[PDB]
């Protein structure tokens, strides 16, 4: 790639992100005074474990749907073979969601936007996975302290998704080329905006992996306890990405083949 080509890549990734960001930043900021009351938090804490799981799994899947669309619109992604598209989304979609989530996290009062209002960690007690929840809140706090712009989130999530180290890729060199061009774009944009200092402050790649592993591990516990709930009331796409041996569905293929 050349230098104008890199800045065109920057513009194209930012555009692809804006079209698929699910919620515009201002819509999340405008709701920050809308906080759950103590009575509403209590109501969430008294919901059954299985109903809170279903609701949370539903919201995760919705967010993952916008990530799939981001990929489909991401320069060079659809030129990868189908196998590698699926590999990359299977391993990276939850990671992208976790990074995007920091937009919905208010570091001032330690709350996250959830079902129309902002609430803290205690909102999720009924899940029985406090360690996973606090890890996500802590990760969202760490990213909020960097004050990502929307352009930086677009470029960083492109790189989270386009990761040539995922096991199972068939055209590893093609993914490497794509990853390298997106890295140049991200680092070029940081340099031009005098934001190279955040590079040392970004989370190690093992953190994002660790959060996704905790998620799958707590899901396995839940699915053992409530197997019919997962079968009857979890989104098919969710089960395909995270469940075992829930990889019996083929939703990703249909989502990618469409359009
Ligand atoms: C850390 C606490 N938390 C969760 C914890 C667990 C969980 O589910 C899995 C555990 C087992 C299933 C699910 C959530 C969960 C979901 C939401 C959510 O969807 N809010 C609505 C919203 C819409 C758009 C945006 S965005 O535009 O920024 C692009 C992402 C962000 C937010 C918020 C907090 C959550």
Curated annotation (Swiss-Prot):
Protein name: Nuclear receptor ROR-gamma
Family the UniProt entry places it in: Belongs to the nuclear hormone receptor family. NR1 subfamily.
Residues of the full protein shown: 265 to 507 of 518
UniProt note: domains: The AF-2 (activation function-2) motif is required for recruiting coregulators containing LXXLL motifs such as NCOA1 and NCOA2.
Record note on quaternary structure: Interacts (via AF-2 motif) with the coactivator NCOA2 (via LXXLL motif). Interacts with the corepressor NCOR1. Interacts with CRY1. Interacts (via AF-2 motif) with the coactivators NCOA1 and PPARGC1A (via LXXLL motif). Interacts (via AF-2 motif) with PROX1. Interacts with FOXP3. Interacts with NR0B2.
Tissue expression notes: Isoform 1 is widely expressed in many tissues, including liver and adipose, and highly expressed in skeletal muscle. Isoform 2 is primarily expressed in immature thymocytes.
Description of what induces expression: Up-regulated in the state of obesity.
Medical condition linked: Immunodeficiency 42: An autosomal recessive primary immunodeficiency characterized by increased susceptibility to concomitant candidiasis and mycobacteriosis. Candidiasis is characterized by persistent and/or recurrent infections of the skin, nails and mucous membranes caused by organisms of the genus Candida. Mycobacteriosis is characterized by infections caused by moderately virulent mycobacterial species, such as Bacillus Calmette-Guerin (BCG) vaccine, environmental non-tuberculous mycobacteria, and by the more virulent Mycobacterium tuberculosis.
Phenotypic consequence of residue 114 to Q: Completely abolishes transcriptional activity
